[PDB]
């Protein structure tokens, strides 16, 4: 059983701002509407997980920040209790993702910062995997090509800051064929 040291409506459901302790270990100290979570609210968990953001119809729909106990952290848009919209995600070793989300799935255009390197992976993300048009930005050069499963797949276009557009396709999953053209750009 759980307790609710807040306020209720004329029917009996939870409505308005009020503290609430869930029976399985979690608690919530935000706003309630019609017996469901709605509005800006804080949701603690059993461990140190934390969500502070908007709620619509007992579901995370709105701009809010989520903290996970393993070190990952999301700030950005939520919709229908799963990740949806533009948002900024940091991972367990400061790996930064700023991009789209479809349904807990890391979709759309997304900037991936490899903070151990400083290189950027921007471009099309499909279903939590590097697939589509891609631009692997590094410090003084970048790879304008296509990724299939965390690796380049086919024809690529290599931009260098010294002024050369290296043309080359990926004949395998790992190796790169540098043939045939180098173009001034």
């Amino acid at each position: 059983l759980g307790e609710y040291e807040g306020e209720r409506n004329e029917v009996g459901e939870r409505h308005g701002h009020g503290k609430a302790r869930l029976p399985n270990g979690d608690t919530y100290e935000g706003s309630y509407e019609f017996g469901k979570r709605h509005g800006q609210g804080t949701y603690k968990f059993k461990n140190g997980a934390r969500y502070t953001g908007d709620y619509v119809k007992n579901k995370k729909h709105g701009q809010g920040t989520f903290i996970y106990p393993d070190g990952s952290r999301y700030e950005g848009e939520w919709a229908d209790d799963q990740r949806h919209g533009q948002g900024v995600y940091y991972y367990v070793n400061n790996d930064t993702y700023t991009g789209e989300w479809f349904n807990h799935q890391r979709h759309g255009q997304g900037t991936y910062l490899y903070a151990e390197t400083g290189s950027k992976y921007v471009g099309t993300w499909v279903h939590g995997q590097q697939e589509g048009a891609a631009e692997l930005i590094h410090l003084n050069h970048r790879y304008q090509g296509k990724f299939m499963n965390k690796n380049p797949v086919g024809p690529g276009k290599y931009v260098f800051d010294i002024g050369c557009e290296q043309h080359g396709e990926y004949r395998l999953t790992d190796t790169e064929r540098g043939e045939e053209e180098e173009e001034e750009e």
Binding site: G35, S72, Y89, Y91, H104, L139, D174, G178
Partner: protein, 312 residues
């Protein structure tokens, strides 16, 4: 102590390699200044490395005894890849500058690039991993890899970690060092893929070949053969010298008569690949917390559950 590098330079021109007679004598005079400046036991010509507007000239300096994520730490003193101190000169007459020591995997496993040398020590290396430090560290790491995969002695020259010179070595013929690659053995320790010459337990115990192994057992790469054996003075073969020629490292040579030997490298300091230089792949992207039973918002007790709890 200065070695006989002028007669070794005549051996170089007999093999066709070298900077010329006056330039090798000039390097000998610069090595004489280096020996007179620092208390050096052995100061031999390691070789020189080509660059964009300046070239590096490298000396294998061995000092006297007592005179002068998880990170795998550096070797303490005169062990592994830090056994020989390297001094760098641009053009002889300019003073030599001491190189730093080779560090492990933060340098060696982040070395996997293909980069020209710009002739200056204080030059940033901007590549697919962030190389720590300036171009002197990358030059030192390249010199360590060329020393590991290039310094090659005839078999029987050393007795088998450390090694000593063999006084009972009767010598080996010139024609026996050409037809068979098993008569040549590696001088110094192989660099492990961890990044050192001696394995450090991070708490796997991976190992490489021992100190004195034949180079036929470590032959690369893929379908082509390293260590081309050619015979200079093919016209007069009775007084020929066997000229080794590494294809894994272009510009790397080793020499007979076989009673004594010298090692020499001159090139761009790069390992040859049969394909093009593929860039090192970025690390795989980190996944999020798996959305399961643990990370899940409960939908709170309703008024029916509240009325069930009230009569309880």
């Amino acid at each position: 102590s200065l070695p006989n590098v002028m007669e070794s330079a005549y051996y170089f021109e007999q093999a066709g390699v070298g900077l010329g007679t006056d330039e090798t004598y000039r390097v000998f005079l610069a090595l004489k200044q280096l020996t007179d400046t620092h208390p050096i036991q052995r100061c031999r010509f390691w070789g020189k490395i080509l660059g964009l507007e300046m070239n590096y000239i490298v000396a294998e300096v061995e000092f006297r005894d007592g005179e002068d994520p998880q990170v795998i730490p550096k070797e303490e003193s005169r062990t592994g890849a830090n056994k020989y101190v390297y001094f760098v000169c641009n053009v002889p007459g300019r003073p030599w500058v001491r190189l730093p020591s080779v560090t492990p995997a933060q340098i060696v496993t982040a070395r996997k690039i293909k980069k020209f040398f710009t002739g200056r020590l204080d030059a940033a290396v901007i590549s697919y991993p962030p190389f720590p430090g300036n171009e002197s560290n990358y030059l030192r790491a390249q010199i360590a890899r060329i020393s590991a995969g290039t310094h090659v002695s005839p078999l029987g020259f050393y007795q088998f970690d450390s090694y000593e010179e063999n006084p009972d070595f009767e010598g080996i013929q010139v024609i026996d060092l050409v037809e068979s690659l098993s008569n040549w053995v590696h001088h110094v320790q192989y660099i492990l893929p961890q990044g050192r010459c001696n394995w450090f337990n991070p708490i796997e115990q991976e190992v490489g070949p021992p100190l004195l192994t034949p180079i036929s057992e470590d032959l690369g790469i893929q379908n082509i053969p390293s260590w081309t054996t050619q015979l200079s003075s093919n016209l007069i073969p009775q007084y020929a010298i066997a000229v080794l020629r590494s294809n894994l490292w272009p510009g790397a040579y080793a020499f007979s008569n076989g009673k004594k030997f010298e090692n020499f490298y001159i090139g761009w300091g790069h390992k040859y690949c049969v394909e093009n230089y593929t860039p090192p792949s970025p690390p795989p992207v980190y996944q999020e917390y798996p959305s399961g039973p643990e990370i899940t918002e409960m939908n709170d007790p309703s008024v029916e559950e509240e009325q069930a709890f009230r009569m309880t």
